[PDB]
Design an enzyme around this catalytic site. Structure first.
Site, short mmCIF file in Angstrom:
data_model
loop_
_atom_site.label_atom_id
_atom_site.label_comp_id
_atom_site.label_asym_id
_atom_site.label_seq_id
_atom_site.Cartn_x
_atom_site.Cartn_y
_atom_site.Cartn_z
N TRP B 65 0.82 -1.21 0.00
CA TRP B 65 0.00 0.00 0.00
C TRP B 65 0.85 1.27 0.00
CZ3 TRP B 65 -0.69 -4.21 3.21
CH2 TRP B 65 -1.84 -4.98 2.96
N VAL B 177 -5.14 -11.81 7.71
CA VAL B 177 -5.91 -13.05 7.57
C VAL B 177 -5.03 -14.28 7.46
CG1 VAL B 177 -8.04 -12.17 6.66
CG2 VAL B 177 -6.15 -12.61 5.10
N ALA B 230 -13.31 -12.17 6.36
CA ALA B 230 -13.44 -10.83 5.81
C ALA B 230 -13.02 -10.95 4.36
CB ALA B 230 -12.52 -9.84 6.55
N1 200 Z 1 -8.32 -4.17 1.68
C1 200 Z 1 -7.30 -5.09 1.08
C2 200 Z 1 -7.99 -6.27 0.36
C3 200 Z 1 -8.43 -7.33 1.37
C4 200 Z 1 -7.66 -8.53 1.56
C5 200 Z 1 -8.06 -9.51 2.51
C6 200 Z 1 -9.25 -9.31 3.29
CL1 200 Z 1 -9.72 -10.52 4.47
C7 200 Z 1 -10.04 -8.14 3.13
C8 200 Z 1 -9.64 -7.16 2.17
C9 200 Z 1 -6.41 -4.27 0.07
O1 200 Z 1 -6.49 -3.01 0.09
O2 200 Z 1 -5.65 -4.90 -0.70
#
Ligand code: 200
Ligand code: MN
EC number: 6.1.1.20
Lengths: 785, 266, 159, 157
Positions: B65, B177, B230
């Site tokens: 990110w 996760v 999630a």
């Molecule tokens: N919010 C994550 C994507 C994501 C991955 C795993 C979970 Cl469990 C939830 C969301 C991203 O910005 O790449």
């Protein structure tokens, strides 16, 4: 059904209270709509014995000499006032409910009435007020307060659903309570019968109507008033005591959902005949009403020699003439099971709804007759000193109920509960069911009194109610719905968005009755309604609406009459009927319009709606177009049809003036379409990065030619690079050739990949000017800046 | 007499943005499955955006990110229970931090879906933005298993592409996760697998973070004996595939000739 | 719910007349029978079932008609909302959970449901349910329910 | 790993937790139905516009902006709308425009704003001349909005 607490308590002794009872019946499936305390009797009312009755000379009143401890006189005008009976004596000073004022010692026709003898209505135990209460002359020791043998009672007004006809009998109710665990006391029919022949015969000429029919024989009858406990019981249950025998039959009926009637043998003749009525046959029923029977009516008749005469309306109401009275010595006792449908139709046919018809319509225990005869005969022997015959006269032989497969596992699976097997089988047994086998699936055969028990599911509900619906846990199901169920809600969702966009655009939703006044067909100039009501609420609501706008035009007037709206922009979505049932969307405009409250210029009428409608479809991403066409209910000058995405879906215009006048209304504008509206699938049109070509031009055309045709041709001929095309000005007159007009069009061009060269444009603006004139149209100004 | 085919008053006709339509449809899809939609703040704390989600500094995983770091004072960033939290401010790089906020503010079991604008320092091309939208999903509760995550996505697909659609799960990595996974749905029309989003069973350390923060706020532990899954999916990439948009840059372009094209859509 | 049945009296029917009208069945086909204004939305759970396969969950809202005297709390033309959830293993514990959820959603966390046995020819077990309304502080009798009747399933499959 | 769907009664503190989100959605929807066109504009801001559009300075800034024109976080929603207007007049040439945008704004605290913009000739008849526009056109559209939302609307100078 009225449920007198103390009466029920006789079969279910351990009942906690009327409040706890109401609770228990609720869980059993019986809801009480009311609980009432009913027999308050002041101390001033005492039991008295009529030693003698003396009519007052010249009057139609009588001087009663009463033994009330001490001897007292009272004056009465009651027809039944006679010596030898016991009466309710309200002494001077007594506060009676029925009068409001106090009872006292007063002089009537020469004699001092020391208080007065009461009627059911005066004592306040029944609505009857046409005679004195009649008690057994020895019911009590003269002068003892009546309360001491007639306490107050609490009565539950119980709802008994059609599936539980056995519950139209207090003992039936008792059984359900027993299943819950209460001890059950069933009355013992102590009978001392005599083996001797019945002096009459039974001939059931119509077994269809009288599937099971028995007759009892009781003679040596000493007809007289019922014991105080029975009168109290009967009164609490909504009925009025008559005497020994008649009361016993109502009592037993109320006890075990088994109507029965005692026929005075004086009128029976050679025998009872259960037959259909001969057309014209007459019968003065017990309600003193002289009637005429229909050949479809089952009748209890007698015969003598070569004559057959009606005795009662089988299963509905007995005859007036055979009614048991004081001089009766013997009777034939009817205890039967009648064909529900038959009783149902006859009851309706004559406008009769009786305690009896009600129970036969709902169904009676197909094998309860014989047990009922013992109960009744027994009681008759005890209260009327009846000598009963050992034999009965029977006709019909109903078959017992069959076995029903029952699996405790399914019960628990269906309910989502987990009651242990043993617990279940016990319940069933308490309800009187027989349980055979040892599982997993049992042979459960119900009691003949339970007409409602036929399926296994029927048995699992028995287990549930006795265990208590509250013992069923809560849960939510999980599962992937079957494929053919996907998007099944699209349609419903589609129409909802439509309503919502409308309300957001400015339209106010209105709901109007689906009915229609046949006359409005003529009023609003519409073809006649295809569907009509065989039984309308009124003739103004005798048909089913064919259009949605008439109801809207009406609500408009009604709104102008109650309140006085200056404007109104309405809409309604509803099912309409004609050939096929279809969903319509209709809207109505009216009033001054849009503008500034303090100003004057305004936007309204046809083009206001037409504009609002343009936005709607603009919002729905659908093509909207209004081509002129006539409609009976529309103004000939302001009238046109609607074309959503090409197809015609309805109309738009001003309400025809004449209608406006007959209805006394200002000009009303409106529309009505057919749903669902078309669906135009998206086809993203990537915008062009390059600049667009702007060019104007007016088209000279005769006033009659519709704007639509002009616009259509201009666009059609504008070429594949046309972007916009908007009418920014309409004009007609000097210098143009009158009867003509010019249409100011703003045109745009643009090329997706590159810019457009003046050759392509000025040429395309020609491809139009070409077919524009080739079609017979001018060009006020070409290549206009 | 009136030319009824003549234009009417030019009352304005509104419309909704492509992302709104897409987001709406997504939210409806999950509402039918018992999910409720809640939102979080666009400006976040490094603690909620990273640390709380098991993503520390100088960690190779934090490179997934590209963060926009903020500065300036007087700004009050409020926490889950309305309280005034601290930490280095930044624009959230994903909606994920919201599943931490929600969890410290409620108790299991539950189902939530949280849509939201996210920011990432990246070069804007035809299929890449620095400012886009995600849709998170979080279902916690006693006995929740990975079989349920798979069923949810299966339902998502069916609802989005019809009965001939199908999902595919492959192991992938995420610090929040374990098991972790990436899922793709089969698009019958275009006939190809679209990689939709990542997912997995919430990480032990995420639950611990939540309960620890709860204690610090005086609340009792609520995620000791529960599990949960999630997921998260990019919205534009899906809206584009669905509405047939060629350039992701259009969404924030503000061009009417573009937007006006979606009035019809629902 | 057959004719001359005491249970059919639970619904006062508006009977219709007239020809040329095409009443269409579940699978779009042109059915017959005596026309009338539906007295409840229930018939729709039969239509839906012959047109789809289990498991499934549907709710069907709709205008209903009944020949009755119009007062302050009684109409001849009103609206009902049916619910029907069929599927392998579906139990009465689920009906109770649905209504529990309905209540919570309608009256808050202090709301609660109550079930009492009641009769309906199309269900067995049958029931009536009331929800607790904390504000007005009283039990509101909301509607009836129960486990679909064996004969209803048979009707569907026969058709 | 097989597929399955979970079943459970959600914990009490989760009821109506979606009300807020649902509330703002209706708002957007009523707006689009009233006539407003929704527009999404970047959450960033040009520090200069603070001066240009006469606004207090942006409270939050970017340590690493994509460009200096996007170095701050917007404090108002209208500046971005006024801009998109110009950009629309430059590419295509709209005669009118009734826009709206809902977005998070930053200043002291992060807050959600609703902003709308009118422009052009107005409402009336294409072939006619009399028209409704300017202040009172918006003020009127806004009156309908709140009328629809069942809320009191008032505009004091
Ligand atoms: N919010 C994550 C994507 C994501 C991955 C795993 C979970 Cl469990 C939830 C969301 C991203 O910005 O790449
Ligand atoms: Mn039953």
């Amino acid at each position: 059904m009225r449920v007198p607490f103390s009466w029920l308590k006789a079969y279910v002794p351990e009942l906690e209270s009327p409040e706890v009872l109401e609770e228990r019946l609720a869980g059993l499936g019986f809801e009480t709509d009311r609980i009432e305390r009913v027999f308050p009797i002041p101390r001033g009312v005492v039991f008295a014995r009529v030693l003698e009755a003396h009519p007052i000379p010249g009057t139609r009143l009588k001087r009663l000499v009463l033994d009330a401890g001490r001897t007292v006189e009272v004056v009465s005008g009651a027809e039944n006032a006679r010596k030898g009976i016991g009466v309710a004596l309200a002494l001077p000073g007594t506060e009676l409910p029925g009068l409001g004022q106090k009872v006292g010692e007063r002089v009537i026709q020469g004699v001092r009435s020391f208080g007065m003898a009461l009627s059911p209505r005066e004592l306040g135990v029944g609505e009857y007020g046409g005679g004195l209460l009649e008690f057994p002359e020895d019911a009590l020791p003269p002068g003892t307060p009546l309360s001491e043998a007639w306490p107050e009672e609490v009565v539950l007004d119980l709802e008994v659903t059609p599936n539980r006809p056995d519950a139209l009998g207090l003992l039936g109710l008792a059984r359900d309570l027993h299943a819950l665990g209460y001890a059950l006391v069933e009355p013992e029919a102590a009978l001392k019968a005599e083996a001797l022949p019945l002096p009459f015969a039974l001939k059931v000429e119509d077994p269809e109507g009288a599937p099971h029919f028995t007759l009892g024989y009781a003679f040596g009858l000493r007809v007289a008033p019922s014991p105080l406990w029975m009168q109290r019981a009967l009164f609490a249950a909504g009925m009025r005591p008559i005497n020994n025998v008649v009361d016993v039959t109502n009592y037993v009926m109320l006890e075990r959902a088994q109507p029965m009637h005692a026929f005075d043998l004086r009128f029976v003749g050679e025998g009872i005949a259960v037959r259909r009525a001969r057309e014209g046959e007459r019968l003065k029923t017990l309600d003193g009403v002289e009637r005429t029977l229909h050949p479809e009516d089952l009748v209890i008749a007698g015969w003598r020699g070569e004559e057959s005469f009606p005795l009662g309306l089988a299963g509905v109401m007995g005859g007036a003439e055979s009614e048991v009275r004081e001089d009766t010595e013997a009777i034939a006792l009817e205890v039967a099971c009648f064909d529900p449908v038959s009783i149902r139709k006859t009851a309706r046919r004559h406008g009769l709804r009786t305690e009896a018809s009600h129970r036969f319509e709902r169904g009676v225990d197909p094998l309860g007759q014989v047990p009922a005869q013992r109960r009744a005969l027994s009681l008759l022997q005890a209260l009327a000193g009846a000598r009963v015959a050992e034999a009965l006269l029977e006709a019909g032989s109903p078959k017992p109920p069959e076995a029903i497969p029952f699996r405790p596992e399914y019960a628990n699976r269906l309910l989502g509960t987990s009651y242990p097997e043993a617990e279940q089988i016990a319940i069933l047994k308490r309800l009187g069911c027989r349980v055979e086998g040892e599982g997993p699936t049992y042979r459960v055969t119900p009691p003949s009194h339970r007409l409602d028990l036929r399926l296994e599911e029927d048995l699992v509900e028995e287990v549930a109610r006795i265990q208590g619906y509250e013992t069923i846990p809560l849960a939510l199901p999980a599962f992937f719905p079957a494929p053919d169920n996907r998007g099944v809600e699209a349609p419903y969702r589609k129409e909802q968005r439509l309503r919502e966009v409308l309300s957001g655009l400015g339209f106010q939703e209105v709901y109007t009755y689906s009915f229609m006044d046949p006359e409005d067909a003529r009023r609003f100039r519409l073809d006649p309604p295809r569907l009509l009501l065989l039984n309308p609420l009124a003739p103004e609501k005798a048909a089913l609406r064919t259009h949605l706008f008439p109801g809207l035009v009406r609500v408009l007037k009604e709104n102008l009459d109650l309140d006085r709206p200056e404007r109104a922009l309405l809409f309604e979505v509803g099912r309409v009927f004609r050939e096929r049932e279809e969903t319509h969307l209709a809207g109505l405009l009216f009033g001054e319009g849009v503008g500034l409250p303090w100003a004057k210029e305004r936007l309204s009428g046809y083009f206001l709606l037409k504009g609002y409608l343009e936005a709607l479809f603009a919002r729905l991403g659908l093509a909207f177009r209004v081509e002129a066409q006539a409609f009976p209910f529309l103004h000939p000058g302001v009238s046109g049809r609607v074309l959503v995405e090409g197809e015609e879906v309805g109309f738009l215009g001003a309400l025809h003036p004449e209608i406006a006048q007959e209805l006394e209304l200002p000009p009303v504008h409106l529309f009505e379409l057919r749903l669902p509206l078309p669906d135009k699938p998206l086809a993203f049109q990537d915008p062009s990065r390059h600049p667009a070509a702007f060019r104007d031009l007016a088209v000279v055309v005769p006033a009659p030619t519709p704007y639509g045709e002009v616009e259509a041709l201009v666009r059609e001929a504008a070429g594949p690079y046309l972007e916009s095309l908007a009418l920014f000005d309409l004009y007609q007159g000097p210098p143009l050739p009158e009867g003509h007009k010019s249409l100011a069009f703003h045109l745009r061009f643009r090329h997706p990949k590159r810019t457009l060269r003046d050759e392509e444009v000025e040429e395309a603006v020609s491809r139009v000017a070409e077919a524009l004139r080739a079609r017979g149209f001018g060009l006020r100004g070409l290549d206009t800046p | 007499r009136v030319d009824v085919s003549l234009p009417g008053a030019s009352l304005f006709s509104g419309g909704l943005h492509p992302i709104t339509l897409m987001e709406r449809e997504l939210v409806e899809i999950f509402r039918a499955l018992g999910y409720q939609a809640v939102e979080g703040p666009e400006v976040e704390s490094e603690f909620f955006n990273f640390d709380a989600l098991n993503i520390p500094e100088h960690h190779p995983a934090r490179d997934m990110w590209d963060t926009f770091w903020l500065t300036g004072e007087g700004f009050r960033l409020e926490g889950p229970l309305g309280e005034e939290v601290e930490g280095r401010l930044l624009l959230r790089t994903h909606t994920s931090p919201m599943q931490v906020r929600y969890m410290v503010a409620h108790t299991p079991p539950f189902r939530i879906v949280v849509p939201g604008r996210v920011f990432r320092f990246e070069q804007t091309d035809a299929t890449h933005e620095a400012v886009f939208h995600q849709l998170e999903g979080l279902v916690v509760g006693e006995g929740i298993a990975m079989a349920h995550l798979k069923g949810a996505i299966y339902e998502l697909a069916q609802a989005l592409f019809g009965p001939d659609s199908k999902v595919r799960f492959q192991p992938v990595y995420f610090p929040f996760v374990e098991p972790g996974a990436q899922f793709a749905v089969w698009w019958p029309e275009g006939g190809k697998w679209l990689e939709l989003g990542g997912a997995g069973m919430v990480h032990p350390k995420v639950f611990q973070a939540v309960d620890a923060y709860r204690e610090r706020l005086g609340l009792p532990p609520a995620y000791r004996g529960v599990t949960g899954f999630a997921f998260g999916l990019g919205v534009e990439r899906l809206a584009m595939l669905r509405y047939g948009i060629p350039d992701i840059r259009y969404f924030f372009g503000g061009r009417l000739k573009f937007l006006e094209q979606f009035k019809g859509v629902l």
